[PDB]
Amino acid sequence: SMSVKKPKRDDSKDLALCSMILTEMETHEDAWPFLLPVNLKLVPGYKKVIKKPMDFSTIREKLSSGQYPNLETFALDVRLVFDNCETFNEDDSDIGRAGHNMRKYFEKKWTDTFK
């Protein structure tokens, strides 16, 4: 509250560390469904159903241009990528499986880096 603060957690490396995690996600072999925005002209259903499209290149641009105010807003967009994937894809599809794998991969790096 006013003039009463918890001890300052060091956040000065957060930008660099989120970039490293992102790089690791970008270079994973199962990243291919997630590298670029889904083509909303060529994928029936996507525009109407997925209210907030998200992908790694878009996260990369937002990161590089100071559009994440903190590391939690970054994590929210990453998870959005996987949440969208689950909404639109059957669990037993290559893409559906990619998404489960990438989410697992992300959450471990996240925990190991920050928790």
Curated annotation (Swiss-Prot):
Lineage top rank: taxon: Eukaryota
Domain Bromo: from-to ranges: 9-113
Tissue-specific expression: Expressed at varying levels in several tissues, whereas a smaller transcript was expressed specifically in testis.
Signal peptide range in chain numbering: none
Annotated disulfide bonds: none
Location of the protein in the cell: Nucleus
Function comment: Regulatory subunit of the ATP-dependent BRF-1 and BRF-5 ISWI chromatin remodeling complexes, which form ordered nucleosome arrays on chromatin and facilitate access to DNA during DNA-templated processes such as DNA replication, transcription, and repair. Both complexes regulate the spacing of nucleosomes along the chromatin and have the ability to slide mononucleosomes to the center of a DNA template. The BRF-1 ISWI chromatin remodeling complex has a lower ATP hydrolysis rate than the BRF-5 ISWI chromatin remodeling complex.
Quaternary context: Component of the BRF-1 ISWI chromatin remodeling complex, at least composed of SMARCA1 and BAZ2B, which regulates the spacing of histone octamers on the DNA template to facilitate access to DNA. Within the BRF-1 ISWI chromatin remodeling complex interacts with SMARCA1; the interaction is direct. Component of the BRF-5 ISWI chromatin remodeling complex, at least composed of SMARCA5/SNF2H and BAZ2B, which regulates the spacing of histone octamers on the DNA template to facilitate access to DNA.
Family listed: Belongs to the WAL family.
Full protein name: Bromodomain adjacent to zinc finger domain protein 2B
Gene that encodes it: BAZ2B
Span of the entire protein shown here: 2054 to 2166 of 2168
